[PDB]
Design a protein around this ligand. Structure first.
Ligand code: HEM
Ligand code: HEM
Ligand code: HNI
Ligand code: HNI
Lengths: 146, 141, 141, 146
């Protein structure tokens, strides 16, 4: 997970324009719509029966806020993602039983949401930097599985 | 695409497995849980202790499904229809895991079939398990 | 399998792409080479930097193949037959790479289609590109 | 990535019994037979037209031995696989243009070959230690790609 200085600055500049609560809700909802088997962790969230039921689901939205909030905090620690996400990794393994493939899927959905929101501003070099970030975060979240 | 020659190899190899199928199914699961610990996230409700009767019982079910698939190798989407429904709608196992079980099934076969596990047979069994996996994930979305 | 709604969504989205298909194909390739450097192992003979003439040309080819797949969305195995043979036998591109181009195509679509790239349409496009990818890797062994 | 002392001892114990020549030739040969697209790198090796042709090919045998020899050397650096394979990673990227997915395929074929040779001695815990090793070696060989 090696970002160039230019990439680090592009990551930070774009993220400064991100509504984390909104983007989080959008990314988690899109995950559950695009890859509907990921709904398996969210039985208690109620209606997930159609794209609109999922995207507008208040529990999905609330959960997306939490998830992207933790992601956002991690962007301040790009040189130590494994340490940053160690307790969340342990939690998702031991208590939540979430296959880490889910982290990879969410990363790619998040990249789509950023593209959708930012349009031409989400350039190929900006995407490439975010691909490094999202791979690093997924790898960090998978790291304490056992 | 399973060729007629693949089907020949699969039928011959599974024939040799014979009544050991259930045992090898359990061994493949044990190997998968140890080698690829993320797959345990699908079995938190299981007893995963050494020699777990629950794991052994499940390996028998996996093995029987494979025996059925071999017996109906020309018509696998039909033979496996209820199992495909189950994995798609209820279990919702991420598709990436099917390659992990398939590999562990191959390793198990290799470990028990010194004479039969030729390069050609290895190739055919890999294709077969990939085909099974394709059918089991066909209804996911 | 693509649902009726998936096919409506894919046809509508690719319809909106319209005359930009070739531009978007080139952009998706550029995004792939930058984001996923291992894919560059298949194009050692290409200039793979920004504004590459080889990439612009190749994107037009990729886009045309996708347009044809949309036109023959109920018979992709046959409509893409020659291209499947090419990737399986001449180019021998590892199947893992198809998901990387597919993702870069979705990102490109997202960046250009603010109104049309809804969650349902995204879901349909992902399934469509997965299906194209499955066809293109169907003849590998 | 990080092996426990018990895992390390299990790896070293098995490897001390490995015929690197047979295993290397068998692993590379099976890679080419089972995943025939991998033959793309080896047309200069001559006749690769049937399984028997691939397996008995003197150049496949020689290359398999060479590859598994470097793998074997790597086992003395289990805590710094990335450092040790750095040179080879760059070579496979820049000179040989080998997709790193090939290292992952080879690793799983190697595990099958070890199982085939050792039978019951290749127990599930021994396999599990080897899976960590082969993942680590593939990752190390992929690490310098650009
Ligand atoms: C070769 C591929 C596979 C075959 C042939 C297979 C076969 C089966 C069978 C026969 C059952 C029992 C169904 C029933 O009770 O009606 C089952 C259930 C199940 N399978 Fe699979 N399966 C495969 C892949 C997987 C994979 C890759 C995973 C995850 C790593 C998985 C996870 C499960 C789970 C969690 C259950 C339910 C266990 C329970 O709570 O009773 N399966 N499978
Ligand atoms: C959506 C998936 C894909 C589509 C629709 C597609 C389409 C095409 C088309 C239309 C051609 C030109 C065919 C011709 O000249 O007759 C081509 C060539 C090629 N493709 Fe793909 N492709 C896809 C995925 C990939 C991937 C993932 C890779 C590798 C990362 C790849 C590597 C190549 C290479 C190396 C060539 C030959 C370029 C040359 O002329 O030297 N393709 N592809
Ligand atoms: C689809 C599965 C899934 C994904 C992709 C995902 C991806 C992520 C990512 C990736 C960027 C991050 C940083 C993250 C962070 C969090 N997750 Ni994840 N989680 C997932 C399933 C959950 C589940 C399940 C919970 C518990 C929800 C509940 O019901 O309370 C959860 C709970 C959390 C919590 C709250 C912990 C607690 O309750 O103590 C945080 C923070 N997470 N999750
Ligand atoms: C399918 C492709 C492929 C795989 C899976 C693979 C897997 C590996 C692994 C994995 C454990 C290792 C340790 C390894 C080691 C080596 N490879 Ni790889 N190599 C591969 C394709 C090659 C090619 C091609 C060459 C050049 C051979 C030649 O003809 O010169 C090569 C050459 C080498 C060399 C010789 C380099 C030199 O001349 O100094 C070593 C050592 N390697 N290769």
């Amino acid at each position: 997970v090696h970002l160039t200085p230019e990439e680090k600055s592009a990551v930070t500049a774009l993220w400064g324009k991100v509504n984390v609560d909104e983007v989080g809700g959008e990314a988690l909802g899109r995950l559950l719509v695009v890859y509907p088997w990921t709904q398996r962790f969210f039985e208690s969230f109620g209606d997930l029966s159609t794209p609109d039921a999922v995207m507008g689901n208040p529990k999905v939205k609330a959960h997306g806020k939490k998830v992207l909030g933790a992601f956002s905090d991690g962007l301040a620690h790009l040189d130590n993602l494994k340490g940053t996400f160690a307790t969340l990794s342990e939690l998702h393994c031991d208590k939540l039983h979430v296959d880490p493939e889910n982290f990879r899927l969410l990363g790619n959905v998040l990249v789509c949401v950023l593209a959708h929101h930012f349009g031409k501003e989400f350039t190929p070099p900006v995407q490439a930097a975010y691909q490094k970030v999202v791979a690093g975060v997924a790898n960090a979240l998978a790291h304490k599985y056992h | 695409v399973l060729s007629p020659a693949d089907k020949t190899n699969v039928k011959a190899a599974w024939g040799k497995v014979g009544a050991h199928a259930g045992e090898y199914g359990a061994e493949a699961l044990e190997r998968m849980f140890l080698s690829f610990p993320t797959t345990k996230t699908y079995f938190p409700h299981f007893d995963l202790s050494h020699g777990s009767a629950q794991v052994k019982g499940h390996g028998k079910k996996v093995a029987d499904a494979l025996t059925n698939a071999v017996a109906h190798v020309d018509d696998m989407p039909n033979a496996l229809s209820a199992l495909s429904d189950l994995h798609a709608h209820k279990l919702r196992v991420d598709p990436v895991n099917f390659k992990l079980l398939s590999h562990c099934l191959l390793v198990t076969l290799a470990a028990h079939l010194p004479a039969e596990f030729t390069p050609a047979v290895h190739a055919s069994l890999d294709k077969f398990l990939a085909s099974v996996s394709t059918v089991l994930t066909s209804k996911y979305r």
